[model samples]
Target chain A: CPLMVKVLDAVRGSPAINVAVHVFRKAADDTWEPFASGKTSESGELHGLTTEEEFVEGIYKVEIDTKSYWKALGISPFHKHAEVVFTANDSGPRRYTIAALLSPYSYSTTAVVTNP
Target chain B: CPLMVKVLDAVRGSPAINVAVHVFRKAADDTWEPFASGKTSESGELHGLTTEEEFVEGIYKVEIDTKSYWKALGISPFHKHAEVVFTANDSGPRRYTIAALLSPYSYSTTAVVTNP
Candidate 1:
């Protein structure tokens, strides 16, 4: 199963590297519990932050911490973080590919369960 | 103090009306407590959803419940919701004006503690 994530800078047309990515799955108590986390690679892709737990159909969030990332890049992060929340289909046969397009000013993301 | 929020559709350059807007204040244990909620007005602005309780300086979030909003708009929101996280300048003379620029596909936000 390949669950990959891509971070792209929409304005620069390049991958965003060294960005911190965090994954959270919603729980029965209606809260987001942190599950997995990692940083984007040089290639602007994170193919290694896969989830080991059995997948469930519920709400999931990918929150990116950009303070240090933006600070070093000389961009004052007006917003503290960018989060992507989506529904995960558990019965599907394919893994998910969640990708985000971000700039210093804005961001958006999409998900596709690709293995099947 | 004037703390306002504006929701705009970047693709259309107009205000996003009838959109749900939520506000959260971060707690000591690192949790977001829902403080205020409302929907955008006809002018694409929400001047009524103000937080009456005294504000604190901490991490805060504005989470939008948009599934129903987007579904009715005939736009399949690839992502479920868009969130803006920012620091509240409690000691500032002005209130925080958090504005979000969003479309059916993307979103970005900025914060200005005005009213000083």
Candidate 2:
């Protein structure tokens, strides 16, 4: 029961930009484990980072480079790359909010870890 | 330009479940349009419903009813509602895939709209 991986770049109007997030963990013999990395904060948030909780249930991969954040704004996007694979269920401690809304071709992600 | 929306539920190890999704669009004058609505299939996926191009360039919202989906299993869940808001740019036509992975307590979504 562990799942806390949040990467956001909800660029609404676009001005302050610089995005790079890489988190991979799919190990139980399958290989791949980089755990956590971050960079997205002038307004596009990156919150409560502490490796979140080390993600130890199974099958997790999130890689978003966004082609050098849309070639530093000269713009030629349509998503160069954005991948999200998830499955974490042992269930106990909670506080997960995964959000993504990007542009210069489009993006959207929501997990909002539930507890209100 | 405009973008199409796709919704999928990734349930890797469960016995199968039914989930419902409804999408609403905010008009130029702020009234909401009943853009689309559907229930999950027996295998948990609904694709290409046809209202994929009516959402004009502005704000949009989605609401999910998940409480009943979880109660059938005799297990309690941490989330009763899920909402997502996004801005549609004035760009051209492109198909967007937004997938959601949910369990008794956690979930994740991603917009994979890059034209490869």
Instruction: Tell me which residue pairs clash in candidate 2.
Output: A1-A90, A1-A91, B1-B90, B1-B91, B1-B92, B2-B91, B2-B92
CAPRI accuracy category, model 2: incorrect
Choose the strongest candidate by TM-score.
Answer: 1
Tens-digit per-residue lDDT, B31-54, candidate 2 = 767677776666555554444456
Query: Tens digits of per-residue lDDT for model 1 on B6-56?
Result: 778776667888888888888888778987778888877777665535565
Query: Which whole-number lDDT from 0 to 100 does residue B77 have in model 2?
Result: 57
Query: Model 2, residue A103: what's the lDDT?
Result: 61
Candidate 1 interface RMSD, angstroms, 1 decimal: 3.0
Residue B68 CA displacement from its true place in model 1, Å: 1.9
Worst 10 residues of 2 chain A by lDDT: A1-10
